[model samples]
Target chain A: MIPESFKIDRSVVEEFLALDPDAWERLNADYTARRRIGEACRALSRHAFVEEDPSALEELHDVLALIYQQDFSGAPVELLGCETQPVLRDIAAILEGAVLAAELDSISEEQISAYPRSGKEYVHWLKRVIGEHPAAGHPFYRDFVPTRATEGDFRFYLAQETNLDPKFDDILAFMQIGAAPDEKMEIAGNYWDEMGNGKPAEVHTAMFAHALDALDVNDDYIRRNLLPEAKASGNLASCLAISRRHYYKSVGFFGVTEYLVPRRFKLVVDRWADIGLPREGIAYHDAHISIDAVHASGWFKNVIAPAVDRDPRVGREIAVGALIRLNSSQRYLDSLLMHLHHD
Target chain B: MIPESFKIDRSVVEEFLALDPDAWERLNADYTARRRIGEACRALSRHAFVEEDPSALEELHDVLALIYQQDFSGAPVELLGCETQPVLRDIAAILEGAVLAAELDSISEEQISAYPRSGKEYVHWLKRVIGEHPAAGHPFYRDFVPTRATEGDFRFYLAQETNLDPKFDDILAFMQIGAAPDEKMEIAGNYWDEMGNGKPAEVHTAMFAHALDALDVNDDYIRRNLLPEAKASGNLASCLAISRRHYYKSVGFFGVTEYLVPRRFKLVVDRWADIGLPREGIAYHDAHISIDAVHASGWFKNVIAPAVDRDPRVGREIAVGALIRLNSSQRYLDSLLMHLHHD
Candidate 1:
């Protein structure tokens, strides 16, 4: 909390000029080891980045990760208290190494090539492509702005039964079948709610309907233009991720997939706001912000994390599925972007 | 560890798509409070972003800092031993909040105004601006290209007496006063090494000497022109940040100032490498990669965090110093960048 004593003022910045160091003895310690470690990490990551002998870096990755993990989540100046245990300086090493690795160990080629191994990284990477790349960010929202569409605007959301969620339903069906007993229970619950539990108030379809109502399209008008490229690839994503082929590979898709939901939408929300658009109709995108975070961790912990524990093989498959879904989403967004603009 | 038994491949993804369930009771819990909390955080960040009310977000900022601190450094999906306490799902709120806040609670003004308050955020934000904005990135590196200059091109490195290092020495003198005891010691060490402990091998100015030697200039030709705009403005940065008037403010500048060294230099190294440029003379930039990370964490743990813990005022001041240094660097870069181009 900002205590009562902290008042906003202009002079707070000038205080550093005032200091007595008894002639500069304070800046004299030596740090050759930290230097050595940093150089090694940089070299290893650089090796990976240049696409040279990456497997060599693969081992060092976790080595630096753990050494890096030797940290203080809460940095208290009693920080030096760890000097006796040699933990404090090492903590500094981790903090430094983390940023260093991130800079050097960036995307090399297809994000999916290292899919299962780097599920979280790949997910965050693709999320970054959307967030940082305007090609995706500005044009990606066309599906929501039907009011701005006309002749060859490449319609999708309202594209009749094309936009109908049978594809989503198909994913759920396989999801239920693919899930473990307890997971199946969770999927069953999601499906039941999706279908409305006999109460139309709770149906998933109604949520999208509200979003469409504000987009200036009737059911029939939407039925004419339709979806298949982006939608087809989107549908293909689930088939690839949730197929009866692998159990936890789907977890990679289902598990980390939920983690990225909030990330993908916040930009859409913000860009719309920036252009001063009305926000009344975007519940389909907006509500996910509220709901997905609640589920992503569940997806991480209850769904995939546990399954992966039961079998390490599950981890890679999960990553593969995740990459599949992510790539599919990218393809889907790219296809839709071909005929849209940010206006 | 990849566990002795952890073999990765396909089928693992399929299991998540297969499932068995008895009924739909699993999704019965409620989360309106969570949703409301998220929306508030987003709106507050948005308000902080749009209406300029970050004071509303200051408390939430720390709440998030600590909340974000609540993480497992290593995510082994053999996760979820904490089902009883429900730690993981709560974790999702953080993942969501991070992205939610990032997209909505972005900068309103140039980042330096709230430098101490948004020290890490602002530093990282500027880093992103350069890293993400090709427009900025291409020009940002031009400041370091000594080879591009002609012999008379402001030839100060060989200015014998011009490169004689008194003004450069004065900044270091001011820097020593501006630092706290330990920081002074570090700076003293840096300065000592820069001067070379009575040996040219250990000398700092000679590093730049070698840089200019390669740029096709000798001691006589370099004496003509100098780097006063960037050099003068840079010295002023230390004054504004480390003035006798503000001790903690200097810490913010000093704290984060070091943090950014590695982030900025890594790209230069990579770009030079990418273009098949010489690497022998840029020792000034390269050694920083090895030394600065160690110091940055020290800056954070020792100087800034503790001061902030004692009084929130310090945090804001620290952010101020950071901003001044950052903005000054921007000006310096922008000056040189005036002549560069981005293919």
Candidate 2:
């Protein structure tokens, strides 16, 4: 079954990679293929596809199709001989524009500018930001998930969170590219922890799956409960990780995530224990309660501080990334709260 | 003042980024824009652009334009409305195909398959490979740059080399992305060394610049001697570092570079000393002779071994990367030798 998280959907990408080159050639050759992909691109962009000019629309569609099929789904473009093709690189300007526009839409100057400019100082400021951010004490974890949520409610929480937690190690892996040695070391420490220190049986992902099994949560249930906002949360991390230009932002997103994890996970561990869940079921949260604290400190000292010190310009970028992540998580929690309360 | 190295061309990229979006829009909308970028792409690709079909050519040109503009030169695409453009993602399948095809062209089945499947064992095997690789004992290092070369000859060598040594730190920065934690830490150790351990005067790039000045090597001389193949050598590193898909290959390239640096650099250091070159000129090479040994060992133990142990499949990728780098450097040397002996 498909999961809601953009980063979690390997099957779709794998299937796309497996397709015959000839099949794609014929499909892409169709005139309607242009329209379908173009429409999807427009849907993602801030601007509507207002131009009715068939020539512009045709050109637009081709670029959108390539981005979605290849960038989004990891489609094999080489089979189609588009490798040296002009269409491949021609979309760079536009793609960048869209990303910038989207950034403007999500983060304000006031938000990004609030952080201190120096690297070490910026990190100090970030601790304050994390402390004050709504995400640090979101009602879902502080109130609902811990104290009042029932067994069914916890299951629903797990269903959506399935999109968030399973792909964390993968996110860290992506963060490694183009990183400084100190930052790389910090990220690696966190990654090793996620890997359960070389023990596959204890790997966080494996532990998470075990907990899912303990709760009697089926794949079907997770799929059925998956929300658009949950997918959006995971996708935000995925986008930041994969996009090289947003490297500092990824740092912000990742750093903020670590700082927020331990306390929230402690709550999760407590809630599961209250429900009399098996130790195997609670192990993932239980371990993270302690482990993520170390990760957070290491990330702050090694990764964030050195980076801000190296380039003050990156401080704002990191702030924007951190704010976006916090906002995204808050939106997801707010939506989940409604679902939990109403249903 | 462009150097022969691909990673060393920030000025050109800065120029490109500074261009008005309106200028690019008009240029790209022109049919010739499509054709020009396409021709460049085909020139790099293995296959001939045989078909003269106008429509196919148009599509091909657009894709190539985006890749060259963005991937190669770091052009700012935000000026164009191509954000969420179909052409952006449609090029993915084709790009993968071209890259795969190039890999096949460069690496032999025997070459890749010869490595051991186990990670730790593969790393152990790599040391032997490094010792035996033609790159480790190339005549350019063992003979020309050290013992017999004249002051003028040395200047010429430095002219082309201006590209290789200057951009090393940047190369390591790119390698950080998508790396594992231990690997990141190892890379960071090397990177920190490159940064001159926070002492600005000792930074490798700065030291190299001083060496260039001591030799009376003008920017004009560097530009004059920068060979086509030399640029190719630099471009390979740039491609591996910047391209996310080639992360493992980058690790191989980086590790091999570190392993090769010490002995070769020692010879160069001796040669400079014999000529009574200023201490400032010889410092970079002298320092690298010792530092890279440590870097190589750390890379082997912390970076390479852990990676191979974690995923045996990556061994082949790493091996392929190492071999390709060795081969690329050899080709550059071969070309340089011909120029040296003849001129």
Candidate 3:
């Protein structure tokens, strides 16, 4: 059933795919390479779905089918019907292969019971494979639809793909009103414009592109001025000042993006930037870099500093939150860079 | 080998016993009766200590020796040694007996695993034989010295017991000073006290006597002054006044004994009162009847009312502390009475 909250115009997907087959092919190839590496890892050990019981295997297969249908048809088959496209066909084939392999490799109760000594090792291997798999790990891996391509619109994609019944007003109420002006947003937009030749994917994507450009600027600024100055000023006071400035500026940049991005899209776009290459190439980075900087700043100034000042008990929580967010963003960015540059 | 904190002359144990031969005989009779029941129960079931490995059995035996030595000889012993008492003597006997009577009883690891399902039940059986005889299920059981005979000197006894090791001072310092004085401390103390007195044999005999006397006075006061006059007048003022007076009087009575008894002797007297019996055929009435009345009034006016009026939060904590202490004391008294009279 097509959820009212996620009513996607099927024509949108067709238009995007038809716009440039070559560009779509290039994007698909890049994704395919990553997926293949994950597949090879799974095949070598047969440990991807080792934890699945008989009932769980059945459930997993159903889930896999749903993921495939969403990716290929831009919605579940029941909702979008059987529309054939080269890229969609290729994705469906890949998903089908993955499902079969996973089922074959899945750990059984009997197997676990037999090798209790080495069961932990087998389980760990399975977890690693699942964690690394592109199709399994990506939030939008099997549910990507051009109509729902933009970060803001991804919720619609998920809702439709999962047949989720949502109240539009309730969803809308969660959104923050009045967009905050962010340099990163403007920069990311310009970057997206450059990448798209003045034709952005959607409003959300356009904003994200601008955010990414801001991040690039922030990164450059840090490399050129902040890093050199920090090294030159060997004194503790100078070091602290430099550190604080870097953190403050980065936080401000990240905060703006977080504030700008629809809450649901934040994790996905941030992940995309982390992965190093957005679906549209370079445009993804344009949006996230500065967005995250603004976000980091906002959190430090508004949430963290005030909370610590009000109640020192909150200091630990703030520290933990900052550490986790920083680690997560760093991981995403590093992974993306690795994929783009290495492969 | 004697601990330094336990300053009781070694000759005191023999002196006290020699001075009260008849009392000793009565106590011995009670213990013998209880011990027989425990032996019988053990003979009937081997499930008690079957799972305890040889090392554990050795440890248990060591503990039993300490319990026996402490109770009979009046000397402090290590907790590890004390814990082993139940396992070595009681549990081992039961398991061995059960195994020997395999024809009559089905002995299995499962059965042994279920022995003394809870500390309360285990403690009840232990206390029953020591507190009451003939009607008691066991004959050889005697209340532990730490709980009953040594209550008057428990703090010193504990200090002496633990003092052999340098670590004792750390724990003592932590409890007395390092730890904050809050509701948490009261709650923890209540828990420890409940565990100590819930046993049937060495439970609070003196407190039971005191509570009974208080109940009698309280009932009489309520019936004659509060109920009758208040009903006739149709005014709650008289009823409130009477109720307050009764409560104050009860508290005062409890306080006199509580305050007069040296802190070191508190545990000993309290334990004897818990047994719900009068020493040397004396009437088993409220031990607190004479002393607590004065304390009750003083405590209400000086400690309770003022504390409450000053800070509601502090008042709440104090009230909780009082309620827990009183309720636990009452429960121990009732249980002791039930064991004595009901049996």
Candidate 4:
């Protein structure tokens, strides 16, 4: 049976932590660090709320929402041992307390209320689903308030705000998977070969290997960077570390795969006929030869590059994260080659 | 008053011809050289019609329409003079006769009647407009039949067919301009720069300059290779020569401008503040960028390359055509630069 407290099983956390200790630690540290940034960001948000500046406050709300959606939703759901519904309720109660604090601090309740709260609805639903718990008052609440603010702003105002940089660390963390470096390198080697010359079956096998490589990379990064630190310091460092590592690996996985897939397919097709492969054998290669080229170009111009240019620090983190994952894949390739020779 | 014969005064022809003899000769040769290719193409088209292959015939018809539109629409409006309406009517009659010949050769009259002549409403209007002319049974009508089908089946079926290629040439000649190489180049350059870049004023100046450079290169190649041979033959090479020059220049202009503009704008924005340019200056630069990058890519991939790949001779011709136009623009740009410097 699921636990009633807004806390996840220690074993489950350990399982995830074990998958990628470094990445897990990094993600946690990032989340915790954000609470400090939230202090500044929240203070600014309060100013906007006091001024009855719906637009400014709304923008802050959106940023906060993005933070929560990315970091909390899944883990929090697991922690509460309930569906996403309960987690959202906890979020709403925190927001309510934040609102009450602002009112007590001489910002009128009317002004706070005037600040748009589309994200507040999500928190309200969470409260209704999950019984109100005391842990909601953890400094995690400070992080929650800004999260809701970010979400509200992003959804309403910043949708077209391309000038802002993307959250690269978040992106990278998501892209990287949990695995040893050698295992990942082996998968990368297989992927590169399949992409270069393999038939459809080989190509697919290579791709699966690559995915496994990414997963391994992500898992390892999390375990090293996130879990141990969180166990030691209940401080925000754990959250920040976990978040930063996860973001880096996530972006890297997404970026490199998007970049390489199409060109690989084209090379495959050009060699297909000479290799005595039938049309069906290279059907996937043929299909993506043009499609992936176009997709890759668009992905870089519209998504990756634009986002990177917007936030340099996040961009650097994401790039490093991707590099780590790529290294992991390279390591896996080395191991695979060693095993092959031994066999 | 309009001339009854749809022929212009010799002085007008001379004036136009005098502008650039080489350019006019080139344009004419381009049309002349295509005589055989056009014939083969039309013969293939007639064969499709005779075989009652609607899909193939439709494709052929569309190509024919494009050919006609490109040649006709591109002709100088002044070339028609007072006889513009009458010439248009004659051209329309010739096209109608060509279509009817195809219909009669391949399908039954009953089938022709049921076939949608009005599928393109303009064709019906063209027929109606041309039908008003009293002298309708010109040589064009009698000469439009297919002659010497390349395929055995088509040749056997249409034993009485006339060579339609030369007749189509006759129709083109009737509408041909008498401009010299220099004159044709000037007109074409004006048309390219004025129309293509007019929409975005900021980029227009730069784009026009690039187009001029490309045209200059095109003309230099043609003058060295083509002019003397035509002069020896006592045939005006202005149209054909200029057309070939224009084609090459267009490829270069389209390719470079499309690739460079976006990158250039990006650089400008990156260093704008450092260069003492107002941040607002980037508004225009930013707005002026990227519209042509994709367009240029499409032009090269879809238009220039395909045309070049299809027929080496025509490819050469188009390249030269673009060059002639480019040279004309160079002269214009030189004068503009001089004026600017003087000021």
* Real contacts recovered, all predictions: 0.00, 0.04, 0.00, 0.00
Q: Compared with the true structure, what per-residue lDDT tens digits does model 3 show for residues A1-343? A: 1112221122423443343434543433343332342233333223224543444333323333332223222121122112223233332233333443332233333322321123223223323332343322333332332122443333222222121111111111111111122221232232222223223243333444344343343334433332211211111111111111122222222332243234334455555555453355234434444544554344444433443344343333222222222333333333333332332
Candidate 2 vs candidate 4, TM-score winner: 2
Candidate 3 Cα deviation (angstroms), residue A201: 9.6
Q: Give the runs in model 3 whose Cα sits over 4 Å from its true position.
A: A1-202, A206-295, A309-312, A329-342, B1-343
Task: Report the Cα lDDT for candidate 3.
Answer: 0.29
Per-prediction DockQ comes to 0.01, 0.11, 0.01, 0.00
Give a tens-digit lDDT track for model 2, residues A140-255. 88888777887788788888887557767656755664465577556655665666655666668779888888877788997678665675565566666655556777888888
- Minimum summed lDDT over a 10-residue window in model 3 chain A is located at A164-173
Evaluate all candidate structures by whole-model CA lDDT and list the values in order: 0.40, 0.63, 0.29, 0.31
Q: Write the per-residue lDDT of candidate 4 for residues A170-190, one digit (tens) a residue.
A: 222222122122222222222
lDDT of 1 at A251: 57
Residues B1-343, candidate 3: write the lDDT tens digits.
Answer: 1212221222422342233424433332232332443443333232224553444333333322232232222111112111122112332233322322321132233322322333334223323322332212211112332243422222222222121111111111111111112311221232222122223221233333233343243334433322211121111111111111122212222222233323323334456456553442122222233333443334344433443343333322232222322332333333333333332
Query: What TM-score does the A-chain of candidate 1 achieve?
Result: 0.49
Q: What share of the true interface contacts does candidate 1 keep?
A: 0.00
DockQ of 1: 0.01
**TM-score for each predicted model, relative to the true structure:** 0.29, 0.65, 0.17, 0.19
Q: What is the DockQ of candidate 2?
A: 0.11
Q: Write the per-residue lDDT of candidate 4 for residues B189-303, one digit (tens) a residue.
A: 2222222222333323333333223224233442333221122111111112112222332343333334344654554444443444444445534544665455444444544
Candidate 4 lDDT at A334 equals: 39
Estimate how well candidate 4 is docked, as a DockQ score.
Answer: 0.00
